[PDB]
Each structure stands twice: as structure tokens, then as C-alpha cells.
Amino acid sequence: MEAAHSKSTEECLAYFGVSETTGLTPDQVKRHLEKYGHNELPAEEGKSLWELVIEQFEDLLVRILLLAACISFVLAWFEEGEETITAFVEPFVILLILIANAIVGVWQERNAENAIEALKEYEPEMGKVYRADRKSVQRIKARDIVPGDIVEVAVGDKVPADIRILSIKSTTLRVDQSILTGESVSVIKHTEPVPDPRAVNQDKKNMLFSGTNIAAGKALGIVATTGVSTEIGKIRDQMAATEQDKTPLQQKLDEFGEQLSKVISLICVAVWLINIGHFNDPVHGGSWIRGAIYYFKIAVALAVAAIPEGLPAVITTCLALGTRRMAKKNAIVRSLPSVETLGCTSVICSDKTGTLTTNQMSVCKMFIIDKVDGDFCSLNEFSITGSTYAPEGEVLKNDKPIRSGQFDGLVELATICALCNDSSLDFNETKGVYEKVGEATETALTTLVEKMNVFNTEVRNLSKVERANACNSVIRQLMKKEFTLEFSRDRKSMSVYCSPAKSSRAAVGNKMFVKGAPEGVIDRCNYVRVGTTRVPMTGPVKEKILSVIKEWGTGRDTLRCLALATRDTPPKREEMVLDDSSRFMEYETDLTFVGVVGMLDPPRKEVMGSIQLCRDAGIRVIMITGDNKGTAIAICRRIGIFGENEEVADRAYTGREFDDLPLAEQREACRRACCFARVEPSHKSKIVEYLQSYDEITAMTGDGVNDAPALKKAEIGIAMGSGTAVAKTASEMVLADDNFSTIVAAVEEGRAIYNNMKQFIRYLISSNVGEVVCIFLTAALGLPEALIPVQLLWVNLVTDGLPATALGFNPPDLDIMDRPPRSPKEPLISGWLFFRYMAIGGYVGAATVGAAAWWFMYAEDGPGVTYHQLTHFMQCTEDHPHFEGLDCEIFEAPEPMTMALSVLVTIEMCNALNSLSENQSLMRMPPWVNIWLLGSICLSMSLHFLILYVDPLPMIFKLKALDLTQWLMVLKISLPVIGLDEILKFIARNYLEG
Ligand code: BEF
Ligand SMILES: [Mg+2]
Ligand SMILES: [Mg+2]
Ligand code: NA
Numbered sequence: 002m003e004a005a006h007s008k009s010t011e012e013c014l015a016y017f018g019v020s021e022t023t024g025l026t027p028d029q030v031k032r033h034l035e036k037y038g039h040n041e042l043p044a045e046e047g048k049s050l051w052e053l054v055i056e057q058f059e060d061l062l063v064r065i066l067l068l069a070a071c072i073s074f075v076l077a078w079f080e081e082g083e084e085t086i087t088a089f090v091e092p093f094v095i096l097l098i099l100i101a102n103a104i105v106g107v108w109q110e111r112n113a114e115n116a117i118e119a120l121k122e123y124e125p126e127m128g129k130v131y132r133a134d135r136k137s138v139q140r141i142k143a144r145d146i147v148p149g150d151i152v153e154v155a156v157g158d159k160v161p162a163d164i165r166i167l168s169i170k171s172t173t174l175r176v177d178q179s180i181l182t183g184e185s186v187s188v189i190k191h192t193e194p195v196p197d198p199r200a201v202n203q204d205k206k207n208m209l210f211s212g213t214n215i216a217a218g219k220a221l222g223i224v225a226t227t228g229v230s231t232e233i234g235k236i237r238d239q240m241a242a243t244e245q246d247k248t249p250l251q252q253k254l255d256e257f258g259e260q261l262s263k264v265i266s267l268i269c270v271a272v273w274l275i276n277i278g279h280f281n282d283p284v285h286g287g288s289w290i291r292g293a294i295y296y297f298k299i300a301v302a303l304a305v306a307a308i309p310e311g312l313p314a315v316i317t318t319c320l321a322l323g324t325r326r327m328a329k330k331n332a333i334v335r336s337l338p339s340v341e342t343l344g345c346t347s348v349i350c351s352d353k354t355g356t357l358t359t360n361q362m363s364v365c366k367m368f369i370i371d372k373v374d375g376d377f378c379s380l381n382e383f384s385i386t387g388s389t390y391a392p393e394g395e396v397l398k399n400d401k402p403i404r405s406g407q408f409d410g411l412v413e414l415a416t417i418c419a420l421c422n423d424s425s426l427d428f429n430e431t432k433g434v435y436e437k438v439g440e441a442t443e444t445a446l447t448t449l450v451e452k453m454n455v456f457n458t459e460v461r462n463l464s465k466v467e468r469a470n471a472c473n474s475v476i477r478q479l480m481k482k483e484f485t486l487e488f489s490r491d492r493k494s495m496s497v498y499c500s501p502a503k504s505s506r507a508a509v510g511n512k513m514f515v516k517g518a519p520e521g522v523i524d525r526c527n528y529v530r531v532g533t534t535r536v537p538m539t540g541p542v543k544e545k546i547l548s549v550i551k552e553w554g555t556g557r558d559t560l561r562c563l564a565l566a567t568r569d570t571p572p573k574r575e576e577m578v579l580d581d582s583s584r585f586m587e588y589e590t591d592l593t594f595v596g597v598v599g600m601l602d603p604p605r606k607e608v609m610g611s612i613q614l615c616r617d618a619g620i621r622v623i624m625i626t627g628d629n630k631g632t633a634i635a636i637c638r639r640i641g642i643f644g645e646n647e648e649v650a651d652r653a654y655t656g657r658e659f660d661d662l663p664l665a666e667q668r669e670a671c672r673r674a675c676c677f678a679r680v681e682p683s684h685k686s687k688i689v690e691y692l693q694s695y696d697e698i699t700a701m702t703g704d705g706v707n708d709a710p711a712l713k714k715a716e717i718g719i720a721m722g723s724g725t726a727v728a729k730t731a732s733e734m735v736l737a738d739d740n741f742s743t744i745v746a747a748v749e750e751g752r753a754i755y756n757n758m759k760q761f762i763r764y765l766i767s768s769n770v771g772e773v774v775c776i777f778l779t780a781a782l783g784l785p786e787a788l789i790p791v792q793l794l795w796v797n798l799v800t801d802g803l804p805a806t807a808l809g810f811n812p813p814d815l816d817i818m819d820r821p822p823r824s825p826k827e828p829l830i831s832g833w834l835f836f837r838y839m840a841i842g843g844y845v846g847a848a849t850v851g852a853a854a855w856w857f858m859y860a861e862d863g864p865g866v867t868y869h870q871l872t873h874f875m876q877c878t879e880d881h882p883h884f885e886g887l888d889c890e891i892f893e894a895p896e897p898m899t900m901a902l903s904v905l906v907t908i909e910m911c912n913a914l915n916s917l918s919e920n921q922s923l924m925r926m927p928p929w930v931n932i933w934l935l936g937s938i939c940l941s942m943s944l945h946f947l948i949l950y951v952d953p954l955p956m957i958f959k960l961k962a963l964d965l966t967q968w969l970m971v972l973k974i975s976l977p978v979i980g981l982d983e984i985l986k987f988i989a990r991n992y993l994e995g
Contacts, residue, residue, distance in 0.1 A: 005165035005225035017149035024131035024151040033147040040227035057103035061258030069305040070095040128161030164209040164222035174218030183627030187216035248338035273300040344751025352703035353626035362445035366599035369410035378545035392451030405453040419476035426469040492586040513568040522564035559635040560599030566592040619821030633678035685711035761808040770842025787853040787901035803937040804913040853897035907975040
């Protein structure tokens with residue numbers, strides 16, 4: 002049924018042709034069912050195939066390396082008939098690496114999914130219909146409910162479908178709609194058409210929305226829509242139709258992955274282009290190949306050389322590591338790149354109710370009368386700590402602790418609160434939390450009484466289950482509740498008639514205990530209580546009470562206030578008639594004013610600090626709430642989004658106001674404004690979209706189904722653990738404990754993760770630049786190999802790979818949470834950092850060659866050949882005239898090679914230290930700053946001397962121990978890489994940004 006809300010009860014019955022009295026017929030059911038389907042959602046798209054392992058392979062860095070792993074295989078297979086099948090173990094181990102890395106990826110994806118999933122209860126949910134089968138009610142499963150049928154709901158029921166209320170059986174029906182609309186206080190429903198054409202869900206006061214619950218009352222309705230067509234369904238689709246780019250980190254990597262893809266392609270050319278016209282008289286005939294087409298093959302062999310084999314693993318090790326650090330602070334992260342997103346966020350958008358707030362009505366102030374001396378009236382005002390329904394907290398007066406029991410006025414106040422109450426408390430053993438039973442604004446009082454513990458009852462040993470209503474039980478023992486005078490919109494109050502229970506200390510007073518809107522109640526008071534005594538309601542008293550009430554109702558604390566009284570001398574039960582609520586106002590008169598209670602849906606305690614921390618880190622916070630504007634701002638003020646008496650002129654907008662703006666101005670308003678109230682789920686998203694249109698990286702934080710689309714839209718959606726199931730599946734982060742300060746932590750985490758990466762990318766890559774420059778110098782000068790393909794595979798993956806990993810523990814600067822968020826366009830590697838590590842890669846290249854060469858020509862351990870012999874060693878023959886005294890085998894000596902490897906390592910172990918700080922001298926931050934680095938350094942060297950001295954290794958790696966003076970040379974060559982880098986760091990602090 003379309004817009005049942007705009008119709009009438011009759012128009013709606015008519016439309017389906019049904020009886021409010023009997024309900025649908027099984028034939029009507031049968032049809033209605035086949036026409037509309039089962040009131041439910043489609044099977045969650047939550048089943049990712051193992052071919053989503055092919056999503057772990059969308060990273061240009063793995064793609065790149067997979068090409069270099071298949072270009073190696075296609076350039077390794079059959080390329081020399083005389084090949085021993087043990088040179089293929091590069092592409093093979095590249096496989097086993099990527100296979101693994103692409104898997105530890107999918108591990109966290111489901112490791113996350115079923116942690117988040119662990120947070121849901123129950124198995125099924127159900128409803129209550131009247132069909133023409135039985136004259137009575139029927140507990141039917143929620144799915145089997147169809148449009149058209151007659152449902153009944155009572156306090157505590159979750160509304161099964163979207164329903165058009167037909168008849169309110171209780172005097173008054175209240176609905177908790179916070180999961181859907183963000184509304185702080187349950188909403189009073191009526192049964193009349195909502196004509197309004199611009200009318201929104203929070204205006205459909207004659208409708209009951211699936212997902213929502215009953216705070217009070219009982220009602221009969223007719224199902225308007227079901228499954229996907231509910232307000233719950235619509236938003237579900239809306240959320241799934243929202244598209245998403247890749248994380249900003251993944252984007253930065255793919256941006257880099259393509260910069261690398263360019264240089265690799267630039268080299269394959271450069272070298273090939275430089276030689277094709279020089280292949281003539283090759284002499285290749287025996288070799289059976291076409292050349293300047295085989296020269297190509299060596300060009301790509303250089304390409305593959307430029308790829309840091311070990312990179313995608315260290316990255317995926319850095320992240321996974323940071324994910325696990327967040328999980329100890331109780332943050333489930335769905336995907337690895339997501340642990341960064343927050344580190345570079347410019348704006349955090351945040352929902353209010355249940356996000357910034359607990360959505361648990363709390364009494365935090367209360368007063369009674371202290372003294373009445375003629376024109377003088379003093380009050381006893383108290384405060385209560387606590388922010389949830391949990392009976393945990395203390396009562397203060399003047400900010401220090403009291404026993405409520407010590408004030409008889411507090412004893413009565415407690416008593417009214419216990420007795421004049423249709424609700425209770427309950428501990429949910431499964432979720433491990435206390436929860437309201439009934440109406441939020443009533444349970445606030447239940448909780449308050451438990452905290453107050455007015456009789457000093459021992460409660461220590463009680464299960465949280467038994468403790469929930471303990472103190473209230475004790476009070477309910479003093480007086481039998483004989484009946485209740487239900488609320489009514491005319492007087493806005495209620496009361497209970499109570500006879501004393503045990504004939505002990507009972508003055509026969511059949512008291513009535515009363516509560517309601519303050520001045521309604523106060524105007525019917527003649528006396529006021531002062532301890533156990535009573536006195537006339539003088540005028541200055543009435544002025545004193547009311548002045549404080551107006552205070553509490555406004556400004557700094559914008560509390561919902563409630564006046565409490567008793568009729569000391571109630572009528573007799575006989576002379577009082579109940580079937581007419583219009584009598585009630587009169588029964589509640591001649592009253593004794595007792596006290597007042599102030600309550601609100603309070604901010605979560607961490608929030609305010611968190612919001613300041615963010616601000617100190619250059620991040621805006623914006624509130625987007627479906628709740629009303631007044632409560633929205635009040636809350637913005639308490640938490641610091643706005644200040645004490647700051648003007649929020651054009652800085653706060655409702656949904657209507659915003660929608661009235663022209664699109665150009667809407668986008669503009671999202672730039673200045675920080676409070677949007679009364680918004681639809683759609684707005685929440687549109688606003689994020691608007692912020693993203695300033696190239697701004699934004700987060701979203703929420704709990705209810707109305708945050709879902711906005712949560713899917715943000716670069717990160719953060720969901721509260723106690724939030725709806727939709728909000729969680731749309732988010733990428735989930736605060737299991739609702740601790741808003743994790744956000745401030747998950748962020749500074751994600752700034753450290755970027756810096757470490759950026760750091761160990763500069764380190765690993767200069768390696769492959771050195772390794773490449775060396776293989777190129779060797780071919781251009783015509784010297785023997787200084788380093789072989791395998792010696793490098795090991796260096797890259799292991800020797801280098803560990804110190805790279807232990808860069809992920811570089812102590813984060815303290816200035817880190819002082820700087821703004823990095824600029825969106827600013828790339829990972831700049832044209833300076835490039836030159837910078839290419840100068841390292843440069844030197845490294847030269848040095849390793851120098852090493853092997855210095856041995857051939859000057860080392861006292863190895864015959865000092867001339868540059869000419871070394872350059873023409875291929876022409877060496879059995880005692881050639883030009884190679885006098887030499888053994889041609891000497892050009893394969895393991896000494897120049899051991900000499901060349903050691904220089905690499907010792908420069909990489911050396912340059913690892915240089916990789917401690919982008920610009921801070923090794924003087925400032927010393928070698929010993931990072932300890933987990935020095936651990937790697939020594940383990941690397943340890944595994945070096947291992948390969949040299951461990952029998953089987955020297956042969957398989959083609960190496961031989963180095964003597965002292967030799968190592969003495971290895972160092973002389975490697976140290977200056979420091980002095981070199983040191984010279985670069987100076988350049989980039991005293992001359993550039995200076
Ligand atoms: F519940 Be939110 F504030 F919309
Ligand atoms: Mg390689
Ligand atoms: Mg909310
Ligand atoms: Na998201």
C-alpha cells in the first residue's frame with residue numbers, strides 16, 4: 002500500500018478489503034503472499050568466493066610482480082637447452098610468496114567478518130496477527146506476515162512490518178524509533194491521516210516501522226509494506242547501491258605501482274634502443290636466435306631486476322600488524338588498507354543518538370527543599386554520575402558523595418520514582434549489559450533508585466541479574482500499588498494509588514504518588530515537603546522551585562525535567578472512578594511538592610576529549626542527526642563542536658532548511674556548517690558526497706540503519722558495537738566497546754603506518770636500484786659478474802626484508818598528532834625522494850663493482866691483473882700471451898663475489914639506519930633509537946657469516962670467507978653511504994625547506 006500514512010483507517014481497510022475485526026482470510030493470505038512475497042530481506046550477499054582471492058590481486062604491485070614472475074618464466078623456460086631445473090626457483094618462490102600474501106589478506110577479511118558477526122543475537126523473530134482462522138491472537142514468524150493483515154503490538158515488541166495504526170488500545174502509545182530516525186525520546190503515535198506532502202518518517206506519527214520497538218502501550222495496525230519495501234528495506238537497498246572507491250592508501254600504492262611500471266618500461270627500452278643497431282656480426286649462429294630481438298630479452302631481465310621482490314609482503318606485514326594493534330583496543334578492521342584511512346581523514350562526520358550519545362536516558366540532577374523561612378527558600382540539589390542504565394554511580398552534593406538515605410526528602414523522591422513507574426531494568430547476560438524494560442524515561446528512574454539506594458541495602462553479592470531491580474524491590478515492599486492513573490495529554494502526569502503494605506509504620510495513609518510536567522504538577526500543590534514535615538506552598542517557594550526548573554531546562558544543561566509530588570490524604574477508592582481519564586486531573590490535586598529530576602540522553606564520556614584531540618590534529622567533526630535541532634545543538638555544545646555561547650547562525654541546518662537551499666549553496670553549507678538535524682538517511686550521504694567533492698577524505702560514525710548509506714559512502718565507516726546490524730556491515734571499522742577515543746587512536750596509528758611504509762619503500766627500492774645499476778655497469782664495462790641472480794633473491798627477500806619489516810616499529814614522532822592531515826594529491830614518492838634514493842642506488846651500484854674490481858686489481862690475496870685483462874677476461878685462454886700467469890678460472894674466483902655481496906649487505910645494513918628518519922641525522926636520532934632494527938641488523942649479518950662459514954652454503958652460493966683486511970675494505974666502502982645520505986638529509990632541511 003502506497004503512503005498508508007496519508008490515508009485513513011477506513012481507506013486502508015477498504016484498500017485491502019479486510020475486517021479490523023476478523024483479519025485476512027487464508028485465501029487472502031495465500032494471494033497476498035504470492036503477490037508480495039515473504040516479509041524479509043534477500044539472502045545477504047555475504048558469501049565471498051575463493052576467487053575473491055583474485056581481489057587480493059588487484060594491487061598493481063602484485064600484478065606488476067606477477068608479470069615479472071611470468072616474464073621470468075617465459076624468459077627462463079627453454080632459453081638454453083642445457084638448463085638445469087634449479088634456476089627457475091625465482092618465479093616459483095615469487096609464486097609461493099604472492100599466493101601467501103594474497104591469502105593472509107583474505108584471512109583478515111573473514112577473521113573480521115565473524116568477529117563482527119559474533120556480535121549479533123538472536124536466531125528468529127516473530128509477530129502477532131489476527132487472521133480469520135482463530136478468533137484469538139497468533140504468534141506467527143515475521144517472514145510469513147503479509148501486507149494487509151492485522152497485527153497487534155505491545156510494550157517491548159519489535160515491530161515486524163511497516164504498519165498503519167488502526168486503534169490504540171492503551172490510553173497512549175509510545176515508540177522507540179532511534180535505530181531508524183535517530184530520535185532521542187520515544188514518540189507518541191496517533192491514528193489519523195498525515196496529509197503533509199513533504200512529510201517524513203518522523204512526521205508519520207500514525208505509522209509503525211519495522212525494526213522499531215514499543216516503549217509503552219498496545220496497538221492494532223494493518224501491514225502497509227513488507228520485506229524490501231519497508232523503510233528498513235529501502236535503506237538497505239540504498240546502501241547497497243552506494244558505490245565505493247578503493248582506500249586512499251591502496252590508491253597511493255597503485256599510483257606508485259604505476260610510477261614503477263613506467264621506469265621499468267623506460268629501462269627495457271633505453272637499453273634495447275641503445276643496442277639493436279649494434280647487433281651485426283653477433284656472433285650468434287650457433288646460438289640459433291634472432292638478435293636485437295634477443296637483446297630485448299636482456300632489457301626485460303633488467304626490468305624484472307628493478308622490482309623489489311619482498312615489498313608486497315612487508316607492506317602486508319606492516320598493515321596486518323597495525324590491524325592487530327587496533328584489535329587490542331577493540332577495533333575490528335574489515336580490510337588491511339583500512340587501518341590507514343583514518344590517519345589521513347580531514348572530516349569525521351558523526352551521528353548523534355547512540356553514536357556521540359549512549360541513547361540511555363540518565364538522571365543527572367535532582368533537587369528537594371532544604372529550608373523554608375518565610376521569604377527564604379533553599380534547596381538541596383544533587384548530581385548523579387553515570388551515563389547508561391547500569392546501576393553504577395554515585396550521588397553527590399556540592400560535587401562530593403552523600404548517602405541519599407540521610408535526607409528524608411530523597412527517601413520520598415526515591416519512593417515516588419519506584420512506585421509511580423510502569424517500567425523496570427534487566428541484565429542481558431548474553432550481551433553483558435543492563436537494558437531498559439519499557440520506557441526509557443521511566444527506566445532512568447529505576448536506575449536512579451538503584452544508584453541512590455535510599456535504605457543502604459547490601460547489594461554487593463548479587464548477580465547483575467538480581468541487582469538490576471534490588472533497591473526498587475525493597476521500596477515496593479513498603480506499599481501495595483492498588484491502581485494507576487495513566488498519563489493523559491490534558492494534564493501531562495500520572496500517579497499510582499498506594500495502600501500501606503504491612504500495617505507496620507503505616508499511618509493508614511493510602512497515598513497517591515504523582516509525576517509529570519513540572520508546572521502542571523506544581524499548580525496542583527498546596528504544600529511542600531521539607532524532610533518529613535509539610536508546609537504551605539508560599540509564593541517565593543513556587544518562585545524558587547520554578548526558577549531552578551527553568552535553569553535545568555535550558556542552557557548548559559538542557560535536561561528533561563519532571564516534578565514529583567504526593568497526595569498526603571487521597572480520596573477513598575470507592576469515590577474514585579477509573580474508566581474516564583478526564584477525572585484524573587482532579588484526583589491529583591491538593592498535593593505536596595516533593596522534588597524534581599533532570600535527565601537527558603547523555604554524551605559518551607570519551608567523546609568530548611576525542612573531539613578536542615581531533616581538532617588538534619586538523620580534523621573537523623560534523624554532527625549529522627535525524628533527531629531534532631534543539632537536542633542536536635544542546636549536544637554539540639556539551640561536547641565542544643560549538644562553544645558555551647557561540648553563535649550557530651548559518652552553522653546549523655535542519656533537513657527542510659538544507660533541502661530548501663539550491664545545490665550550489667548546499668555544497669557550500671557543508672563547508673561551514675557542523676550540525677545537521679532532522680535529516681533523512683539520504684542527507685547523511687549527500688553531505689559526505691559534498692565533502693568528498695572538495696577532494697576531502699571523510700569518515701562516518703554511526704549506529705542506526707539511517708547511518709548505513711552514509712557509512713558505505715565515506716572513505717571509512719565506523720560503527721558502534723551496540724549499533725544495528727546494517728550499520729556494521731556497511732562500515733569498515735567497528736568499535737566493539739563503543740569507545741570513541743579508539744577513533745583518535747586508530748587515526749594516529751594510521752599516520753604512523755603511512756610514514757613507516759613511505760620509509761621502507763625508500764629503503765627496499767634503492768636496493769633494487771643498486772642491484773640493477775651494478776648488473777648494468779658490469780655489462781657496459783665488460784667485467785665478470787659481481788653478483789648473481791640468486792645472491793640477490795636472498796638479499797632482497799631475507800637480508801634486506803627483515804630490517805625493512807623492523808622499520809614498521811620506527812618510533813612515531815610526537816609532532817605527529819600536531820600536524821594537519823597530509824594533502825590528498827601529494828604522492829607517495831616525490832621527485833626529490835626519487836633522486837634521493839637513486840643517488841643511494843647509484844653509489845650502491847658503483848661500490849659493489851668497485852669491490853669485486855678492487856680485488857682483481859689491488860687485493861693482495863688475488864693476483865693484480867690490469868684493467869685491460871679484466872675487461873677482456875673472456876678472451877683468456879690456456880696461457881694466452883696477454884694473460885700471462887693467470888688462470889682463466891680465476892675470473893670465477895668466489896673472492897671478488899663474496900667481496901661484492903658483503904659490500905651490498907653492509908651498505909644495506911648501513912643504509913637501514915639511514916632509513917630511521919627521513920631527515921633527522923643519525924646524530925639526532927641515533928642508531929640505537931630503534932631496537933627492533935638492531936635486532937634485524939645483527940640477525941642479517943649473523944645469517945651472512947653463516948652462509949660464508951657454514952659448509953654447504955659457500956658452495957651453493959659460490960662464496961668464500963673474507964679475511965680481516967678484506968672486511969676492513971668492505972666497511973671502508975660501505976660507511977660513506979652514511980656520509981652520503983647524511984649530505985642529502987642536510988640538503989633537505991637547511992637549503993630546501995630551511
Ligand atoms: F541518531 Be542519529 F543522531 F541520527
Ligand atoms: Mg628479480
Ligand atoms: Mg543514531
Ligand atoms: Na566505507
